[PDB]
């Protein structure tokens, strides 16, 4: 279960084709990455001639996107009812940094300092906030909560009981 690798030599049969072909040199040249705003100067083994070319590999600057409010949205459009401006801000910051991994956000959301809220509580709250912002500036918490409690009940279903449930189902 190994892997052969490319072989170019094979045999001493290649006397020529080199004297006419210079080995393009390589240098441990410095460089800067655009993705680093400070533009830290690092190094590459570029082939000399390939000097000054923009950092070709930093074109992946795709990120999450979260909205913002200043003084009225939290009171006019996205007018809050249960959260603090601080709680909305903290949620949105955790979202921006975590790029919308709600389980990650909740497990890394302060439940004590901010209002204690399940992961789906934060999910539904954000749904309200973002949908209000979208429509004014122009997602199913309940059913999913029911389905999830059902899921965990079935999971906790004692293994023997699961066994007879499956035995019936197959017996059909």
């Amino acid at each position: 279960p190994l892997l052969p690798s490319d072989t170019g030599q094979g045999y001493r049969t290649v006397k020529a084709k080199l004297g006419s072909k210079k080995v393009r040199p390589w240098k441990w040249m410095p460089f800067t990455n655009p993705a680093r705003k400070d533009g830290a100067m690092f190094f590459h083994w570029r082939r000399a001639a390939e000097e000054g070319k923009d950092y070709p590999f930093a074109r992946f600057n795709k990120t999450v996107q979260v909205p913002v409010y200043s003084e009225q949205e939290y009171q006019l459009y996205l007018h809050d009812d249960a959260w603090t401006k601080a709680e909305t801000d903290h949620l949105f910051d955790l979202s921006r940094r975590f790029d919308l991994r709600f389980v990650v956000i909740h497990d890394r959301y302060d439940h004590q300092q901010f209002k204690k809220r399940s992961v789906e509580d934060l999910k539904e709250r954000y749904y309200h906030i973002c949908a209000k912002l979208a429509n004014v500036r122009a997602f199913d918490a309940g059913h999913e909560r029911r389905r999830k409690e059902q899921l965990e009940r079935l999971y906790n279903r004692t293994p023997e009981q699961v066994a007879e449930e499956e035995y019936l189902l197959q017996e059909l």
């Binding site: 030599q9 006397k15 080199l18 080995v23 040199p25």
Partner: protein, 360 residues
């Protein structure tokens, strides 16, 4: 067509061609430097305006220009060959930083532009010369020391041990004790003369204490040597006082495990499952390491410290001064290894890092 083998000893370069039994040319690896920088013995001959220099410090490179020029002069005078129509095989000490590997690869490719290149550790090539599968290699080289447990022609960098003690430090200590005996040894000539006296009469004591008793009682140990000036030197206990320092770093004020103690440490660093086999597969290294009473004494010491429940079968090739180069010639003379070479266009298409991608 030709096949090139390059063995770079800690302080002497010894190159040759695959299939050969012995290196083409041999000489100490020192570099001159004007206050044209000349090479090895070439520089030595011009000591007045060229200053001795050791590019292989600690068994390691110092300045790329120095070995650039050693290769320059090598090719142009000793080999007097066109390596750029032949593969170039090179060797290295273990645990070498990747920096040195890429640097030497680039220097080869650009400066000299030879088609086929490849690198491999000295110890494993010497083992290949030794014709055995699994075992532990002691790198009693010339400038630095290492202990390489090689398995299935494959070694674990962690398990290796290092120590920069070798013939140079042994010669320095022997010079020191000989001066203490009432002599003096200062310049290069004196250093080489001390090394000569060592190579002639120095040996490894069996029971160092009863050996002292015999040297101080049996004058037979005290012997006569014609110095270059002609002076006759009585040399008794000092024939073997220095070698015992190998197991006793305290001799030189240093503190560490003796050579065989180091080896036991290493074999412990391995896996127990095959340490019996390793014991069965001892090794030796270094042309400056064949001194009488050495292999047997080391055998006794391992038998003592190594549990007797395992078989301790020593391996002491009396011809090991070139083991590494000989293994290199053997390897370069193998069919399946020819494919494994690395071409110039391969560097041109992948850069120096291709060595760390393929050269293993």
């Amino acid at each position: 067509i030709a096949a090139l083998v390059v063995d770079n000893g800690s302080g002497m370069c010894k190159a040759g061609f695959a299939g050969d039994d012995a290196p083409r040319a041999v000489f100490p690896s020192i570099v001159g430097r004007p206050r044209d920088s000349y090479v090895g013995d070439e520089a030595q001959s011009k000591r007045g305006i060229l200053t001795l220099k050791y590019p292989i410090e600690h068994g390691i490179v110092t300045n790329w220009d120095d070995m650039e020029k050693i290769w320059h002069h090598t090719f142009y005078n000793e080999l007097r060959v066109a390596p750029e129509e032949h593969p170039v095989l090179l060797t290295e000490a273990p645990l070498n930083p990747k920096a040195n590997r890429e640097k030497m690869t680039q220097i080869m490719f650009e400066t000299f532009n030879t088609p086929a290149m490849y690198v491999a550790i000295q110890a494993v090539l010497s083992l290949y010369a030794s014709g055995r599968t699994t075992g532990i290699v002691m790198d009693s080289g010339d400038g630095v020391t290492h202990t390489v447990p090689i398995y299935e022609g494959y070694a674990l960098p962690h398990a290796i041990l290092r120590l920069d003690l070798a013939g140079r430090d042994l010669t320095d200590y022997l010079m020191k004790i000989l001066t203490e005996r009432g002599y003096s040894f200062t310049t290069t000539a004196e250093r080489e003369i001390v090394r000569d006296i060592k190579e002639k009469l120095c040996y490894v004591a069996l029971d160092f204490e009863q050996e002292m008793a015999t040297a101080a009682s049996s004058s037979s140990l005290e012997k006569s040597y014609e110095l270059p000036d002609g002076q006759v030197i009585t040399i008794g206990n000092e024939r073997f006082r220095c070698p015992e320092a190998l197991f006793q770093p305290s001799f030189l004020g240093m503190e560490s495990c003796g050579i065989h103690e180091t080896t036991f440490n290493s074999i412990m660093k391995c896996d127990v499952d095959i340490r019996k086999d390793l014991y069965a597969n001892t090794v030796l290294s270094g042309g400056t390491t064949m001194y009488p009473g050495i292999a047997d004494r080391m055998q006794k010491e391992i038998t003592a410290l190594a549990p007797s429940t395992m078989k301790i079968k020593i391996i002491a090739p009396p011809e090991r001064k070139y083991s590494v180069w000989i293994g290199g010639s053997i390897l370069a003379s193998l069919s399946t290894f020819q494919q494994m070479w690395i071409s110039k266009q391969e560097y041109d298409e992948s850069g120096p890092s291709i060595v760390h991608r393929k050269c293993f």
